[PDB]
Design a protein around this nucleic acid. Structure first.
Ligand SMILES: [Mg+2]
Ligand SMILES: [Mg+2]
Ligand SMILES: [Mg+2]
Ligand SMILES: [Mg+2]
Ligand SMILES: [Mg+2]
Ligand SMILES: [Mg+2]
Ligand SMILES: [Mg+2]
Ligand SMILES: [Mg+2]
Ligand SMILES: [Mg+2]
Ligand SMILES: [Mg+2]
Ligand SMILES: [Mg+2]
Ligand SMILES: [Mg+2]
Lengths: 109, 48
RNA sequence: GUGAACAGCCUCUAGUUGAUAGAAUAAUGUAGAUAAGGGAAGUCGGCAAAAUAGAUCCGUAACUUCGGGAUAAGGAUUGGC
RNA sequence: UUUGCUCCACACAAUAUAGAUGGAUACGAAUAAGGCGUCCUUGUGGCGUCGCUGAACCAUAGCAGGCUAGCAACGGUGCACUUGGCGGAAAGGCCUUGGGUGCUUGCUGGCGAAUUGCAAUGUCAUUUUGCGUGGGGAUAAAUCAUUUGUAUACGACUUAGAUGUACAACGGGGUAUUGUAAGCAGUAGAGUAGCCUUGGUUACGAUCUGCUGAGAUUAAGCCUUUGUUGUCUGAUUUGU
């Protein structure tokens, strides 16, 4: 619960972005991925890799992929103030297709 | 139950159903049963 | 680049990414659209909107100051290889 | 719950009073008719009686009602108990049983009262609440936050959530939409350009054909789930 752990998930950005304004789809995808990481790792401090932001914006503001495969690593941080000592870091996995993949524990990184 | 005794020949009619639609309401449902769907469509690539 | 084109649309060099934001997606709006069948019955009034539209070929009336009217009207064709 | 809550009794405090100062004392119906009593032959009966207002009835004497002694009679009345019943229109009252106890002014005595100074409401009722002393009893919820979308401008509404026929994210299946994916192959292809063992071969070629009703998408307010992974005690407030 309050430990370090890395898991790989698939997020259904299609259903999360259904009906969203085109100029807001990619920013909405960023916020939905933050909500996803907060739901699965319980951290308010979610940090998105710039490579993940590139993957989100890869096809413009409206062309967000239907499914994104993310590696979410809940890691502990210790800094100026406590402020949610656990934070989650989200990176892309860079698989060929983000289809037919279940949540797995990484166990190595 | 009704609050009065309706006798209007629209009540008092004995209805016998001849058929009940069970095609999908999630679209323009074409088949009543998966068996009828398989019989119409023949063998598909996934199975059937 | 397309194209007749300094049109529209996309791109290079250069420049900017500046307009208070976040969350929802009721009514009524502003702006943009669609609509069965009918087709101006609406309305002071076809207002608004729709329809037409480029190019090539054919065809083109009354009237006329003989210069026009005229893209009259009305049709056909258009991609790729 | 920094010893909370509630019920009974008691004391002490406040708090006021739409206004106690003997008793709201129960048929129903009619009124050109009735009530009561009585009788029989039980009726729309006979007889008697009454009203002419409650000006009644009951209660009512005692230091705001003290302390005592008797007589008479087994009555009245307060009280706490106790027996059984009836009453739902708002019953929360009505009746009833037995014993105990107090008083009795039904009658006859004994003692007390004063000086509140010639009157001054001259304080006697009931309404809530609080606190303390004992005794009995009980041992939750709601809201925020998260979540749902049968809801929705915001509030509000409807849902779910402490270890499960739980919930969620994925994945699987069903359903549905479109219309046959990429890739590879072809003695398909209008033809065109080369080569020579001149019937083939190489190159270009919209397109066609096969794998392929394939591929893609499918809840975001679709249905379903023996799979995978995870989550499940944060905040505020509420007492008769
Ligand atoms: Mg929409
Ligand atoms: Mg339907
Ligand atoms: Mg040109
Ligand atoms: Mg129409
Ligand atoms: Mg029409
Ligand atoms: Mg017409
Ligand atoms: Mg008219
Ligand atoms: Mg008119
Ligand atoms: Mg007119
Ligand atoms: Mg106009
Ligand atoms: Mg013309
Ligand atoms: Mg003319």
């Amino acid at each position: 619960l309050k430990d370090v752990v890395t898991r790989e998930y698939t997020i259904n950005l299609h259903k999360r972005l259904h009906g969203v304004s085109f100029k807001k789809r990619a920013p909405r995808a960023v916020k939905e991925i933050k909500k996803f990481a907060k739901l699965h790792m319980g951290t308010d401090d979610v940090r998105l890799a710039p490579e993940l932001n590139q993957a989100i914006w890869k096809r413009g503001v409206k062309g967000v992929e239907y499914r994104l495969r993310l590696r979410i690593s809940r890691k502990r941080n210790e800094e100026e103030d406590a402020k949610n000592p656990l934070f989650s870091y989200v990176e892309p996995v860079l698989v060929a297709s983000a289809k037919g993949l279940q949540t797995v524990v990484v166990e190595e990184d | 139950k009704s609050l009065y005794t309706n006798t209007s020949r629209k009540a008092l009619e004995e209805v016998s159903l001849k058929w009940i639609d069970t095609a999908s309401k999630f679209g323009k449902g074409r088949f009543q049963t998966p068996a009828e769907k398989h019989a119409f469509m023949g063998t598909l690539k996934k199975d059937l």
